[PDB]
Ligand binder design. Sequence first.
Ligand SMILES: *[C@@H]1O[C@H](CO)[C@@H](O[C@@H]2O[C@H](CO)[C@@H](O)[C@H](O)[C@H]2NC(C)=O)[C@H](O)[C@H]1NC(C)=O
Lengths: 49, 89, 49
Amino acid sequence: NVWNGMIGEVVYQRAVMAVGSLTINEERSEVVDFSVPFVETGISVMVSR
Amino acid sequence: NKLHAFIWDSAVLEFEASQKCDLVTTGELFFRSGFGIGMRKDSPWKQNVSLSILKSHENGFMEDLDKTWVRYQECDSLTFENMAGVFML
Amino acid sequence: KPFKYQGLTILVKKEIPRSTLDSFMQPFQSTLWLLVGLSVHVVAVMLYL
Ligand SMILES: *[C@@H]1O[C@H](CO)[C@@H](O[C@@H]2O[C@H](CO)[C@@H](O)[C@H](O)[C@H]2NC(C)=O)[C@H](O)[C@H]1NC(C)=O
């Protein structure tokens, strides 16, 4: 029940914003507050040609 | 052939192109956005609605919805009529 | 949060290519019919001569 990283810093009021490659999911969205996404992402599988 | 081009959302036109053989999209999506469940500015439901939508996206429920309602193709795509001339000859 | 990410695009008619009766006859025009007839018959008759 302890957060680390950008989410950890934001939770403990050590950082107002966390700008970066942050993936939105349920736990993060319920522990902190997110904004409208600006770029599409998600789980993807990549292999050698 | 009454309208040369129709500008519209990617999902709807892609579904129509999948359903209709004579209709095709071009690709190169521009103005990327997302369909949302809009509601009043001061509504207590919104906070839980966002979490529920994200939870549904987390598991395969939304993938199942895409499979059932959106992701199915009827027709996607020399021939006899091309060499019909030499047969005519 | 958006439940379906998508953009704006263009729908047009497929316009399947049309193959017609003279699909073999485009390379040369109709005048070449008479031209080749003349170049064959005149050669043949003078060879007979
Ligand atoms: C959003 O979900 C939370 C989680 O269940 C709801 O909070 C509960 O609300 C009920 C009724 O008010 C209480 O009896 C529970 O004790 C609450 N639990 C927690 C953990 O807070 C909240 O009411 C929901 N919001 C809306 C608008 O439906």
